[PDB]
């Protein structure tokens, strides 16, 4: 069997070469044309498989496995609309730099024709998002077509780790008959390639005249899956305040120089002249702080550990493509700069601000109170996955010194795929998901992975019956007559039926009090639905956004 | 063994199928990777080859071969930047709807990699301009890789004829070794395909209220390689004036209803009220007429025999995708109205305007005087290829009732590849090329085909040492300190040396008096360089542009 | 009016910010729609313009200015097929990593429509080649239209200098009226931005198990515009032979470990067993050495100082993105071993090989002898620009220890734009061009830059009236009847007329004896045409390709 041999050799060598570069699990979607490679993944004894019927949720689930395992994961689907369902997670992968390996199976080269049944053009179909894309040769007996696997995987490997990391696309034409020879297990190897690892440094001589000024600020944004330890060391030696995003992983250390309440301080009118700012990582969540960067005259230095850097919210004076740890290690040099006065001011504001939050949280009965209680209930060394919209903004204002991790899909900021991404992380981590009802409806299909494979994850569902974030927009007042139809968008759905469909336990609370004396338990994966009111949430959030306004004028 | 026989079969079949759908000649550029299909065309007894070392001029030479033969023509190049040089003529073919078949050879799929030596991405590299692009499978002995030719040639044929006409692209990977079995001549077939022929008609009931209004106008723009006879029939029966562009192929008939001086008329301040206009073809050359279309309140009907209709310069009231003949034929079987005084008003403007042009052409000493003489010197039933920039504007104003044809690359309006396109038509037609010096410089490499292949074609070279069209720009006054350097851009080239290099005879005229008593009949192809001055040309053109202002006010 | 001020503020700020990021030259092509930006470049007192009517040659001319100045250069053209003529130089810039800045002028959105007169789609029209593309907004009075220039310029700057270097695209729509206010000279500023610099390092310990083996080779390909000195330092300490390409810039040092005759050695039948190879830079010219790399089972390391690494001709076992100097200074932490015998075998072969080459050049009378004599004549510390096809193969075989630099277009290996690229380099460096007749005809229009602006550059034209390189192909014997028509392609042109047209001096040599006893350097730029015969060249080259056979007796 000349064809069966070549197809088996190609498909089994490809799966092993994916293993050789770090792939340990794949998410497969059912289909006919994907048969040869699907069987290779299942037969390979060191590649775990996950079968997912929904291609959209499957790709977001794989994004979750990548964020949880810190390894590249591959997805495999058949030809046609299946591949088109990958685009949302591929788009989030592009911005968030997720090493997602997209494999689309195709008809053989001689049979392809755009416009035929189930025949879209798949070659370079993700060109808008990926940095690597290749159309595999058809399998034959020659040595050159096998070496293409080694040749192309070596090129592709530069996009799976380091700063060039991002989604890649292999298009794989397969000729009938499709089923390979399952006896050739000798071609299912488990070798391990040596991966290149670098270390960077910069000469900061021309920068010491800035860094030696007194009123300096370190601003750390999204830093999931990066190391941040040397940021704390530089801050301790040089007395520099750190404004730390929730996704910076820096608030859990309880560092005496970490400022967590900056979004409330700036919202309430904090206005200080600062000499320089060191923006590290992806942008922060705080709308008000990002707007302050577009107004300050401070010297701006941006530090980001990826290629294709974007300088949101404003072009800095210099942009460094380097890891935060390597950057701050180049900056350590004995100097006699006293800025204790500058640091003691920020340490003092943060003290009073942390106190005012605790006073608001004692009298709060709104959605923000529910979020504060979940923060209190989360065990140390555990993790929260926070959905987009308001949950991630409440975490910013409310997470202070708890030793926990928070994760999010803060790349494209979509409300899609949150369930699937959280579940993928729960495969490897102890995580609890916090989500609004619109995102929960968006990726309801994602719960199938919990039902079929018993992935342990509780879900804290905030149900204010629509889009709450829009209450804080000007259209609530300038388009009152159309607000609830265009922006409210209530579903009115009974999510207790969702729990029974996907075999979650269900509990509903109508006040923070019942939530306070309850206990989240890992006996089974359960959905806790907390009922809030969007109008009530807006009123109470307004109270919170101006709580610090008195201390600012008082400290002045 | 099998490889040579599989490669021969695929490549000889592909060449034979191209013949079956209309291809009779190809323009090959040298290279190694293009070996198998290059030898196929040369071996095929009914496919003529042209070998051109400059891929840019080669693609424009193919465009000319298409325009002169009215049959699709293929170009073949090797992998790499050879394919990238095709892009200018591919972009011109997208707008002008030229059925140019673009064949790029590639390395085999298993060896492909963007960034390797001589390795750009050729798959869908012309996606920005073509309506059909295919990456062929590597040659096999199986029937399905051979049937892919029959399958994709049938799909690609819809872009070679009719309204979907335009450029198409095949990327052909070839595996080493690349030489085919030249003795397998049985696979070099010469079948001829039967092809669909349609006729269209529209329901004109909801257009009769417009068409029965008196003050109507038929505006015919670019109609190259299209049939226009029923336009004259409808105009005769219904007393409608025809504002005929030079490229409409209508001015040569000396029809009593064809107005040739509309551009000067509208330049001189014509401001008649019009009930409706029927715009047929691609946009006209006249900037002033296209501005008037953005101002008139007339009912606008657009008629174009091609898909992807663009509606320059303004969206009409209705757009019909139909040939001109099939459009006017569907309106002919109707009753008639009396609009004779409207037709005669226009006929009187044309008679006096033509009399004023004859007067101007006796005094003038500028570039437009040279152009008018060439029209007079052109033998009847012969053709002219007009460059872009000023020459196409001067033909618009000066070509009246002469029985000649005029062609031009009026899609992208590029100054590139003019020489090669003109020579391409010259293989099939009696053609004289009129061209400015900068465009002559641009495609000087295109002259190689005249030397190597003995293409009889004379060249009238209008040399004013720079870009004369920019004299009529507001920058000539508003940016005078920088004008000559930025817009003038003289070369100072002695084009007699170009004539010697490419084995052209040469003659240089400094005045229109010498050119008038000269003769363009030549034993060998020859280059006539006519020396003019850009400022002198600007000043005399402004008199020409305003000449009809007094006669217009006397109507 | 208001439009004239907003337009002026846009183009004057755009041109200044280009200067701020390093642009000093711009090559403008005439057109109407380009008027605003064209006058801005002319009016700017510290940007020099070149005016070129042929966009194809113009873009290759800019490539040469980038190579000569080692700065980014911008090109500007009007709408339509003018931009399409840029494609070949952009393709070469993609592979060779040339920071070519492509500026295409476009109609405003109200007149943007594919199919309209002179209206091709220009936005992302270079998606196939460039690393950055942007469609500028139409100028208006808002500050954000200006701020987009500062924002986008910082992003685009990362593609102009480092390992991410490559062609970038700006499409700029301009609305009538087009003339800017030339009295607003205050907006044409000459600030200079600070640009980041890094130093990388790898952990040599991961390669330890390989680099302690004795039969190791360093193979250095195209390294032009790169630092190369630490390769010599590393090879000296560790006794490693260096096979050096002409474009490696390493042959001009007479380093005891540099091998320049490897190609002839392989052609002459050299067989060798290698423990490891370290491939540095872009691929080597030698077909034999690249074919050998596909057959050896040595451990292979690839090191390139650019992103988007391709691994031609075979997949290495590991590949590093790092400069050669940073890589080898990292390998300098290892202790040495004993491979002195291995080095001696290579040093002895190179000694006899150089004597055999010198012997050949005394006897040869073909195209080869002309090239060998041109190298001898060239002044030291001057430079050659070598065309593709045979001249670059002959320089590989004949260039030994002459103290000169060699440059070429070795990305896409096209025969287009060679003349213009050398001329661009001659503006910043002392260079003589060596080019075959078919490539000379291909870029004949590029000589306009020499007539108009009086660039000093001699041209050595190897005229054999056809494609000489195809003599060495299997087609010469397999399809001999069609060879002259399809591969020879004689033009029969008398290039004395080309010299008169572009105001060059002309001298024609029919014998190597005439050429050896002549003087080339002169006050005026000269075209030296050396008539040779393709058939005799093939035969004499056969003797050269076997001139080193009597030195090879045993496998290395
Ligand atoms: C895929 C996608 N569609 C739409 C949006 C726009 N969007 C942002 S927030 C939001 C509503 C989120 O509602 P919910 O999850 O209930 O949270 P809440 O606003 O109540 O906190 C929408 C539709 C988006 N970000 N992503
Ligand atoms: C490829 C290309 N580049 C630029 C232009 C812009 N352009 C239009 S007309 C013109 C000048 C051409 O001058 P020439 O052919 O000498 O004729 P003249 O204006 O003197 O009549 C130019 C550069 C173009 N049309 N095509
Ligand atoms: C743009 C382009 N077209 C075609 C080729 C294919 N090609 C490579 S070398 C060559 C011949 C070059 O001839 P010439 O400059 O006279 O050099 P010779 O072979 O005689 O040394 C050709 C056509 C190419 N590399 N690039
Ligand atoms: Ca909600
Ligand atoms: Ca001119
Ligand atoms: Ca030659
Ligand atoms: Cl030497
Ligand atoms: Na498995
Ligand atoms: Na033939
Ligand atoms: Na200037």
Automatic annotation (TrEMBL), chains A, C:
Cofactor(s) listed: thiamine diphosphate; Mg(2+); Mn(2+)
NCBIfam families noted in UniProt: menD
Annotated ranges, domain Menaquinone biosynthesis protein MenD middle: 209-386
InterPro entries from the UniProt entry: MenaQ_synth_MenD (IPR004433), MenD_middle (IPR032264), THDP-binding (IPR029061), Thiamin_PyroP_enz_TPP-bd_dom (IPR012001), TPP_enzyme_TPP-bd (IPR011766)
Domain Thiamine pyrophosphate enzyme TPP-binding, chain residue ranges per copy: 419-517
Xref: HAMAP family: MenD
Pfam family, one: TPP_enzyme_C
Catalytic reaction annotation: isochorismate + 2-oxoglutarate + H(+) = 5-enolpyruvoyl-6-hydroxy-2-succinyl-cyclohex-3-ene-1-carboxylate + CO2
Thiamine pyrophosphate enzyme N-terminal TPP-binding domain location: 14-125
Protein's name in the database: 2-succinyl-5-enolpyruvyl-6-hydroxy-3-cyclohexene-1-carboxylate synthase
EC number: 2.2.1.9
Keywords: Magnesium, Manganese, Menaquinone biosynthesis, Metal-binding, Thiamine pyrophosphate, Transferase
Function: Catalyzes the thiamine diphosphate-dependent decarboxylation of 2-oxoglutarate and the subsequent addition of the resulting succinic semialdehyde-thiamine pyrophosphate anion to isochorismate to yield 2-succinyl-5-enolpyruvyl-6-hydroxy-3-cyclohexene-1-carboxylate (SEPHCHC).
Domain of life: Bacteria
Free-text cofactor note: Binds 1 thiamine pyrophosphate per subunit.
Pathway in which the depicted protein is active: Quinol/quinone metabolism; menaquinone biosynthesis; Quinol/quinone metabolism; 1,4-dihydroxy-2-naphthoate biosynthesis; 1,4-dihydroxy-2-naphthoate from chorismate: step 2/7
Transmembrane segments: none
GO molecular function: 2-succinyl-5-enolpyruvyl-6-hydroxy-3-cyclohexene-1-carboxylic-acid synthase activity; magnesium ion binding; manganese ion binding; thiamine pyrophosphate binding
From TrEMBL, chain B:
Domain annotation Menaquinone biosynthesis protein MenD middle: ranges: 209-386
GO biological process: menaquinone biosynthetic process
The Thiamine pyrophosphate enzyme TPP-binding domain, residue ranges: 419-517
Presence of the UniProt keyword Nucleotide-binding in the record: no
Catalysed reactions, semicolon-separated: isochorismate + 2-oxoglutarate + H(+) = 5-enolpyruvoyl-6-hydroxy-2-succinyl-cyclohex-3-ene-1-carboxylate + CO2
Organism this protein belongs to: Staphylococcus aureus
Protein's recorded name: 2-succinyl-5-enolpyruvyl-6-hydroxy-3-cyclohexene-1-carboxylate synthase
Function: Catalyzes the thiamine diphosphate-dependent decarboxylation of 2-oxoglutarate and the subsequent addition of the resulting succinic semialdehyde-thiamine pyrophosphate anion to isochorismate to yield 2-succinyl-5-enolpyruvyl-6-hydroxy-3-cyclohexene-1-carboxylate (SEPHCHC).
Cofactor annotation: thiamine diphosphate; Mg(2+); Mn(2+)
Entry's cofactor comment: Binds 1 thiamine pyrophosphate per subunit.
Subunit composition and interactions: Homodimer.
SUPFAM superfamilies per UniProt: Thiamin diphosphate-binding fold (THDP-binding) (SSF52518)
Occurrences of domain Thiamine pyrophosphate enzyme N-terminal TPP-binding (ranges): 14-125
Pathways involved: Quinol/quinone metabolism; menaquinone biosynthesis; Quinol/quinone metabolism; 1,4-dihydroxy-2-naphthoate biosynthesis; 1,4-dihydroxy-2-naphthoate from chorismate: step 2/7
Keywords: Magnesium, Manganese, Menaquinone biosynthesis, Metal-binding, Thiamine pyrophosphate, Transferase
EC number, UniProt record: 2.2.1.9
